[PDB]
Amino acid sequence: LSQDFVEALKAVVGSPHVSTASAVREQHGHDESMHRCQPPDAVVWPQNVDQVSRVASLCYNQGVPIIPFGTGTGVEGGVCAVQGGVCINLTHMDQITELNTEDFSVVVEPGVTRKALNTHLRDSGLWFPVDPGADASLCGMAATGASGTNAVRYGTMRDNVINLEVVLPDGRLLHTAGRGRHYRKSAAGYNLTGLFVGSEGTLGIITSTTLRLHPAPEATVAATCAFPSVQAAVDSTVQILQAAVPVARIEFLDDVMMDACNRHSKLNCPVAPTLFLEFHGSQQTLAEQLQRTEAITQDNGGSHFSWAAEKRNELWAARHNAWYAALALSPSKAYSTDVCVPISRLPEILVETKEEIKASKLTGAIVGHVGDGNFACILLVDPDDAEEQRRVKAFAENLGRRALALGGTCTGEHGIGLGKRQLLQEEVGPVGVETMRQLKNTLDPRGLMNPGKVL
């Protein structure tokens, strides 16, 4: 990467905000996944949207790849600079603007995390529900199409993103639903917002997100329920959803995951396949949701609810850190699967996955947003064991195809990145692939917008 080009970058954002140092680049060449670190040629921190546009234009017209970088908590190698180029760390734009409490909406820049937004919303009676376990950039969550434990009731990022400000690859500024606009529904033209949610930085750079806010629940109750088998826990989940109990959270941990979270946190739950549950409503509706949910779990051998305030906070902090609890079993890197299937097929595939984990030499922990028909298998890797690494690939790839055989999807929330590109081709077929690629080509003709990812 030439000296003239570095100086041009410095002319846009300022000398302290451009780095070609090896250590700085290596810190931006990987996320939380096992994908090998591939350092960008430079890291740049733009200070405002005009600078983002000018950096993109400079890179695009010089043939230099662009890698958007949020908080680096992705798990599919999205930020890995597989073709080098300029990593654009967006987190110095960290302002919350256009807070509209009366319309339930807010605008956030990429440096704002969910924790920052909800802390600033304290005493407002509103909150933002989509809750990945990591302290992630909200614009990064828009880019990956993230969900979370609350999504079963309050929706995913796709459900809660109202508008996006996007710097297109050549530097043009797009407001996907129109500058400053926010509303509950629209039929005006083609919905551009949904195209950029889940685009993983391959269609442009999200520089602000307009988010739907939600009213805080009147009352909240959380509990855990232990089961004799995976089958019993997942049958309960499916029957709770089919009875239309509006649970706020319903999370599955197998016995391995439960034990790992016990060891990594303040919990001392029975080591067994377990559901973490949370209910929102008034006192009347809570008692009614509880009684219907306990009846279903009892029918499948579930324990009486272990109730949980500080202890719901420790409960959900343990769940949110399950990824790190799993890593701490083999102090190793990990790969995560992320399939999502029609809910009636969830018992088949979860039980089958548990049986396959045991039948193989591999270690795995299972945790899942099962209210969405979604779960993750966390598979540890010795970073220096090449034989283990292909067995992990082979396992994750066979699980993905089993989900596809059931009518599901290879990723419910994490995205495709580097790891699921072949599975995506099988999921949507040749006309789906060509259509997606035609969309990529019109927004990024030169193929410089995070190349090598998704497609």
Which residues in 368-397 contact ligand FAD (CB under 6 A)? none
- In whole angstroms, what is the distance from residue 59 CA to residue 119 CA? 36
Q: State the number of binding residues for ligand VAD (CB under 6 A).
A: 8
- Which residues have CB under 8 Å from 243's CB, separation 6+? 292, 296
Cβ 294 to ligand FAD shortest distance, Å: 26
Per CB under 6 A, the list member of 133, 204, 371, 415 interacting with ligand VAD is 133
User: What does 367 interact with, of ligand VAD, ligand FAD, none (CB < 5 to 8 A by kind)?
Assistant: ligand VAD
User: What does 336 interact with, of ligand FAD, ligand VAD, none (CB < 5 to 8 A by kind)?
Assistant: ligand VAD
- How far CA 56 is from CA of 14, 43, 244, 448, 450, in Å, comes to 15, 13, 47, 10, 12
Is 171 an interacting residue with respect to ligand FAD (CB under 6 A)? Answer: no
Cβ 282 to ligand FAD shortest distance, Å: 28
User: What does 371 interact with, of ligand FAD, ligand VAD, none (CB < 5 to 8 A by kind)?
Assistant: none
Q: State the number of binding residues for ligand FAD (CB under 6 A).
A: 38
Per CB under 6 A, the list member of 19, 51, 147, 224 interacting with ligand FAD is 147
Cβ 115 to ligand VAD shortest distance, Å: 16
Is 336 an interacting residue with respect to ligand VAD (CB under 6 A)? Answer: yes
Per CB under 6 A, the list member of 90, 233, 269, 322 interacting with ligand VAD is 322
Cβ 145 to ligand FAD shortest distance, Å: 7
- Given a contact cutoff of 8 angstroms between Cβ atoms, the answer to whether 333 and 381 are in contact is yes
Structure-block tokens of residue 193: 């917002």
Cβ 284 to ligand FAD shortest distance, Å: 31
Q: What is the 3-state secondary structure (H, E, C) of the chain?
A: CCHHHHHHHHHHHCHHHEECCHHHHHHCCCCCCCCCCCCCCEEECCCCHHHHHHHHHHHHHHCCCEEEECCCCCCCCCCCCCCCCEEEECCCCCCEEEEEHHHCEEEECCCCEHHHHHHHCCCCCEECCCCCCCCCEHHHHHHHCCCCCCHHHHCCHHHHEEEEEEECCCCCEEECCCCCCCCCCCCCCCCCHHHHCCCCCCCCEEEEEEEECEECCCEEEEEEEECCCHHHHHHHHHHHHHCCCCCCEEEEECHHHHHHHHHHCCCCCCCCCEEEEEEEECHHHHHHHHHHHHHHHHHCCCCCCEECCHHHHHHHHHHHCHHHHHHCCCCCEEEECCCECCHHHHHHHHHHHHHHHHHCCCCCEEEECHHHCECEEEEEECCCCHHHHHHHHHHHHHHHHHHHHCCCECCCCCCCCCCCHHHHHHHHHHHHHHHHHHHHHHHCCCCCECCCCCC
User: What does 205 interact with, of ligand VAD, ligand FAD, none (CB < 5 to 8 A by kind)?
Assistant: ligand FAD
User: What does 128 interact with, of ligand VAD, ligand FAD, none (CB < 5 to 8 A by kind)?
Assistant: none
User: What does 378 interact with, of ligand FAD, ligand VAD, none (CB < 5 to 8 A by kind)?
Assistant: ligand VAD
**Strand pairing class (86-89; 42-44):** parallel
Which residues in 367-426 contact ligand VAD (CB under 6 A)? 367, 376, 378
For ligand FAD, which is the closer residue by CB, 9 or 203?
203
For ligand VAD, which is the closer residue by CB, 338 or 444?
338
Cβ 405 to ligand FAD shortest distance, Å: 23
Is 205 an interacting residue with respect to ligand FAD (CB under 6 A)? Answer: yes
Is 73 an interacting residue with respect to ligand FAD (CB under 6 A)? Answer: yes
User: What does 68 interact with, of ligand FAD, ligand VAD, none (CB < 5 to 8 A by kind)?
Assistant: ligand FAD
- How far CA 443 is from CA of 78, 92, 234, 438, 439, in Å, comes to 18, 26, 42, 9, 7
Q: Which residue sits closest to ligand VAD, CB atoms considered?
A: 376
Cβ 207 to ligand VAD shortest distance, Å: 25
Per CB under 6 A, the list member of 29, 74, 281, 368 interacting with ligand FAD is 74
What is the pattern of x (binds ligand FAD, CB under 6 A) and - over residues 404-443? ---------xx-----------------------------
Closest listed residue to residue 129, CA positions, set 112, 95, 152? 152
Which residues in 21-40 contact ligand FAD (CB under 6 A)? 31-32
Which residues in 359-378 contact ligand VAD (CB under 6 A)? 367, 376, 378
Is 66 an interacting residue with respect to ligand VAD (CB under 6 A)? Answer: no
Which residues in 249-308 contact ligand FAD (CB under 6 A)? none
CA 397 vs. chain centroid, Å, equals 19
For ligand VAD, which is the closer residue by CB, 59 or 334?
334
Is 133 an interacting residue with respect to ligand FAD (CB under 6 A)? Answer: yes
What is the contact surface with ligand VAD in residues (CB under 6 A)? 75, 133, 322-323, 336, 367, 376, 378
